[PDB]
Amino acid sequence: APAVPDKPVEVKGSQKTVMFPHAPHEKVECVTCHHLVDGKESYAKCGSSGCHDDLTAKKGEKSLYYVVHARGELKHTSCLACHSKVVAEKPELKKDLTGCAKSKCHP
């Protein structure tokens, strides 16, 4: 298992880059995000070739946008899906964690 990044890392889309901080996610199993692929574990970039490499489409399993923003019902938890659950318990974090603008992801 490679070391978890100790500084925010870039999550590049086609037009915007969002910084991802691992620290606040220390109590989330690595596997929740870096899910198994072909039964084997992987820590490759979500947008890697052969993964979620469609950086422009809004929907589809190949879309990086969808796996990040789908508000739920997927095979794995998206950023927005989990954030909505967190925000339900800690409402003061609504804009910070789910906002489309002026949020922690999109300042």
* Chain residues that interact with ligand HEC, rule: CB under 6 A: 1-2, 4-5, 9, 11, 13-16, 18, 20-22, 24-25, 28, 30, 32-35, 37, 42-48, 50-52, 55-56, 61, 64-65, 67-69, 74-79, 82-83, 86, 90, 93, 97-100, 103-106
Residue 50: C-alpha distances to residues 2, 11, 28, 63, 92 (Å):
21, 17, 25, 11, 38
54: three-class secondary structure by DSSP: strand
Which residue, among 24, 65, 59, has the nearest Cα to 46 in the 3D structure? 65
Residues of the binding site: 14-16, 22, 25, 30, 33-35, 45-46, 51-52, 69, 75-76, 79, 82-83, 90, 100, 105-106
